[PDB]
Symmetry: D2
Subunit: 378 residues, 4 copies
Amino acid sequence: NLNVGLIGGGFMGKAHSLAYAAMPMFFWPAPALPVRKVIAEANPELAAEAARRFGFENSTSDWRSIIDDPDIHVVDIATPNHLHAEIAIAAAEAGKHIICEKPLARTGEESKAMYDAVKDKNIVHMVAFNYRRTPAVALAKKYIEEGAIGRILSFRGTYLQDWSADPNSPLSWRFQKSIAGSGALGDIATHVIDMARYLVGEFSAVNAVLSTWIPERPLQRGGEGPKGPVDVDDEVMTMIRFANGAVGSVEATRNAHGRNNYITFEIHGTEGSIVFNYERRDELQVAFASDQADRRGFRTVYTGPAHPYGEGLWPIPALGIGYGETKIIEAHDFFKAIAEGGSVSPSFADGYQVALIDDAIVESAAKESWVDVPQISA
Amino acid sequence: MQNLNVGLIGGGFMGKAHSLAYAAMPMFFWPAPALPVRKVIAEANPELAAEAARRFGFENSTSDWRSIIDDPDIHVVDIATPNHLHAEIAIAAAEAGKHIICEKPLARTGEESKAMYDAVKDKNIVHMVAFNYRRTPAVALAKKYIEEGAIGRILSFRGTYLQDWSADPNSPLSWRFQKSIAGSGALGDIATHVIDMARYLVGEFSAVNAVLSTWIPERPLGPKGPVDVDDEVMTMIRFANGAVGSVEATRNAHGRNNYITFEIHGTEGSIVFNYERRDELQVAFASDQADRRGFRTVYTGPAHPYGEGLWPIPALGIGYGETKIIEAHDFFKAIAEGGSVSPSFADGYQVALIDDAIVESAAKESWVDVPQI
Amino acid sequence: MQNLNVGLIGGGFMGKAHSLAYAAMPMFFWPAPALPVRKVIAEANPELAAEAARRFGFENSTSDWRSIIDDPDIHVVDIATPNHLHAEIAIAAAEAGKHIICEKPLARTGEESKAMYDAVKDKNIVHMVAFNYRRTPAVALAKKYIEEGAIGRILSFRGTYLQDWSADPNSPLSWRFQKSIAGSGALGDIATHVIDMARYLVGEFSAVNAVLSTWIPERPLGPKGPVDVDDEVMTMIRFANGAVGSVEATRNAHGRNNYITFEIHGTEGSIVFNYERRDELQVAFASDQADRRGFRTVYTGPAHPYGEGLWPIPALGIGYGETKIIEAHDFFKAIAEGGSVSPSFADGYQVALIDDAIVESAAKESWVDVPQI
Amino acid sequence: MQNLNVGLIGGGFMGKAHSLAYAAMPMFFWPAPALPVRKVIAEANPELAAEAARRFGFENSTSDWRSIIDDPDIHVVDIATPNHLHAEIAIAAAEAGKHIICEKPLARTGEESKAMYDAVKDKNIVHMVAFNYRRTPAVALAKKYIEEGAIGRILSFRGTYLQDWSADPNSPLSWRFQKSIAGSGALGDIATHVIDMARYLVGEFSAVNAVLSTWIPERPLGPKGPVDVDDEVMTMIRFANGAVGSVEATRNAHGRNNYITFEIHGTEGSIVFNYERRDELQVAFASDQADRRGFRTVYTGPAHPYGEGLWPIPALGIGYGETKIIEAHDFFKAIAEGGSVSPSFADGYQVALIDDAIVESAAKESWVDVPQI
Ligand SMILES: OC[C@@]1(O)OC[C@H](O)[C@@H](O)[C@@H]1O
Ligand SMILES: OC[C@@]1(O)OC[C@H](O)[C@@H](O)[C@@H]1O
Ligand SMILES: OC[C@@]1(O)OC[C@H](O)[C@@H](O)[C@@H]1O
Ligand SMILES: OC[C@@]1(O)OC[C@H](O)[C@@H](O)[C@@H]1O
């Protein structure tokens, strides 16, 4: 039994709480049993209502009381980006295992403080880049590590969304630099960057453009009310030189009508190619050069028992993977590392590396030039 | 929020999906209609049961399902056993005044299904058959468009359920291949999902005309035993409202994993669904300007049926679990409100009568009228 | 390389596609089996014929097709008229020893189709029925995979041809909606293409069981006339080799434009084709390693059947024209080599017997065995 | 109706596609703006030339293209040679007062391209560069939507041209891999097509920032000559109208055959195009009701741009040739009407300047402003 203190029970609250409720039913025997012990929220009534909805034993309106609670094994940080650092540093000092939502923090420097706080402790630390644990993405990693597409030449990744494509969508914390740190870059590009690091390798250099299409939004009517500035990017595109000599690019936007949760990649290798589209996340597309010339092309592979993580999921391909299975796989690996005194990827080290890439992107965009990405060891 | 005590019978594949639905439903749909309590799970022996209770988070286990029926604390009996026990268990649970959700097919034959229906038809317990796929948000969305008149009158329906998990002859002779236990093969096991969908979206069947096929007549248990059910079924349909259609299901379609689909042609539009891409509904409106007319791919989210209880954006991703969660939500809403739910044992029994008429039709090679109730 | 003088009868829609094939075939398949010469075009009146000749690039026009039959320098007669003139023209052409390509359906009925077959069967002429879609390179590729055993033995076939050009009841009556001219509706006009494909890929039909529907029974000529043909056909099929299948065609599927498709299940793999994306063939091989198994999207080009005569890279793009070019190539090659071509009038006539059996089946609501030729 | 004598120079791949367009264009677009006469074809030697004339239906053949330029009765010169002869031939044709269509890229460099523009800009001749993919009906439909305001103001554009025909390093060192003949590799050969599409749909390029890659730096011809061009290009783009975007082209993407695509994001909708499925345009309108928004798959036909000249229903099927036919139609219409055509040598030259800016950008690793013609 590992006791979880969840901090924040907003748009993501449902997903985390599901992972903890469900993970043992999927991956059994379970290394440990997550217990939804206590949830913190911004005020006591909120916290109590969240605790009822998500099935937590206890509620608090002061997250510090979770840190000081010696019966709490795991702190799950699901607040806006401005509290990630302070909470994680307090939990690390109290010897807690930590899972933290992305982006790790607002900036590279702030993410550095979080990494520095966990680097030397005997705790499992994880950043919530859940999409790399889509079974189709794990499958792409398997094909690549096997050599089945040869050496990687080129990588394309997108994260295209449209939930704020209407300028009357309100000025939430995601549009305020002081809370979020960045816009599309921090909130969604980081997921793609993580996939790139996972599947291709480390970034050597970036060259980017940041765009804001909608500079003002209604404060939280038809947006006739008072308005505030958007001082973050709506959109980012960046070219990439990988340390291993592959090239690529990443594009993310909040302003692509028709695109809902369109995290995709295309990878070209010397002996084949892989395509993935999270809107059809059950599928991975793979083209092998070795196929006979008259029957050569992308195969649509549906993930199931035969594919990574399949032993813990559904008994046939296409029974259907949702967002929740990715969080379950995430929790499985997290609790497994804890139970075995091991560690998981992506960790705060990966979180910090992504934050350094983001800083380099921002700097590249500002100077209109190639910027070298520092590795976390510098 | 009242607690509703669930006794689950069966801890295999559906046991897990059902258990997830009970653990997750209030998280999803809040405030919840009622709070499910995983109170007792029954399994075939004490060690399995005990193991299952720990896996699925049930307060108690038992190796005798009758212990659940006789427990006055139990509000809900959830039948997730193979098809041969559905009837006994449901009839006992009804006689004890418990709400019932039963896996599909309702029972092995129409006659057996009739007994289950008769045991509930004069009561006001909530009774449900688990045709969960009609509660895919995309399918609910299709129902919405249809009921709105957005595709006009329905002319024609095509439904499939194509699978391949047993397309290898070396796949062994499980209960699903033995008539005595299953009642039928593809027909009972998967075509019923599609028949339900047709009843939900189009309306009642009037007549059927079918062909049943068995491609792999024996399988390993070393020694082998015979397959005495269908591997595949196809049937033409005359709907009571004058529409026409067909349904095809198979276990022998390489490349097809969980390919439950439909295509509907209305006088003012068409709708296409593919469960292997379940987040999508395809809809073509005749009313589109002539230079921008065609199927639009609609991803389900907050704006679509059940969207308030699901994920905050379209394509964050619906899997199998969400269908079972929505099923549980509705079942519990019926119980908390003293209402009924669709599909009920009435629906389950109507489907069993459609299956018998398909079998009869195939044997006689003629159209068979479907008995109504 | 001989010149072969073509006399084309009819200059409507198919006149254009036919004329392109004669103009283009040697550009594609070089050295060409022979050089088509667009010698004379017949149309319904002098002005129409002369205009057709200018547009389609024919040396001569006439308003009297018989003058083409009587011309000793015409080698090929190409029948592109409505269905009611196919038989008199083909029979006259056959009596004059001309090679003949005839549009589908071969004629209005089995009986009428039989008279055309009988007129050619004992002559040393090349006779062809223009089921061009089987010569989509993707469909030829499907045949190659099947012939090689690469999907094993065929269990099951599904074929469609869904259209919507007359889905609006305000679309006017044409000969296509008149039994006396067309012989049948969707059945003759489009399901024949699917039936041909089934015969090509799977084999001969043993029996059929069908339903014919008419959805829009009158159309504007304010005056209206009757539609006395089917808008829609569905049929189950028993194939002589023991496979089963079904075909469905309709004029009344909003969003479906030229949706000729098939899905074939074999013991070792599956093939799926969709003509709206004709460049593609989908194939699933059971032999793929278990973690990399499913449908491959194969784009046709140089490596695939007919690829030497087409574009130098896959997906440079096949349209309707290329199908008629390949058709013309094979036709002229047969003439040059003193051979036969498939599908011939024998094939045309078999399809007309399949159509007759489908119509009889729907009338009687029973299985009807398909006569062999 | 004027008959215009065409002198075609080159009988390779584009020679054939061009010939097809001249044979077919009047059949498609009738009454035609003018009738092309395939008068003379030039090839590298008399044997090739005469065989090309027999194959492509040309009346005369020559081994010397200058005798086409010097022939007073040739009205149109069509340049379908490799990139090294474009400028010489075009400048000669311009001076002889001929109308000119020239294959892409316009020439090997900015300066060569300039001399071609300078030679035609002040003459009363029609000049055209053969960026045929912008006349895919789907791309013309995209243009229509954009110019109507149906997707609002354009924010962002993504374009690709992914191929794999030389992904194998044993594929030989043809002219396309030799800088002194081609000028550049993927950039000039295929990125230019996407750069044209971007200019047509979005607007002029302001600046580029690029990376060029060579993956296979040597090829067979025992000895291996260097590949001294790019295999792949990627570039970011600032558009003069304030939109942003990127283009990526490669010869080294296994599974990608002729994958010229774009995605455009406007303030009120999005458009997506894939030439491997060229019959389709995908469009998402923000104006759709919240429960039925998404990309519509629109199949091009009579209702869409150029539809009057093409096939009578959507998805009868557009191939490569129809793009060349539309190109020829508009070229001949400009000549008949004393107009100009788009894209002209002005456009060809502007694309060559963009290519040079990309090359400069890659070498300097910095943003380069695109010079205006
Ligand atoms: O705001 C966009 C968002 O909710 O989109 C879905 C992603 O999974 C999540 O991390 C991200 O914050
Ligand atoms: O046997 C196949 C099966 O498990 O496939 C998945 C279906 O959801 C289920 O009802 C069915 O029994
Ligand atoms: O009328 C439908 C039709 O034109 O559709 C297109 C087919 O190619 C043709 O044979 C058929 O007659
Ligand atoms: O070399 C590749 C190529 O042939 O691919 C097809 C394009 O249409 C053409 O312009 C281009 O040169």
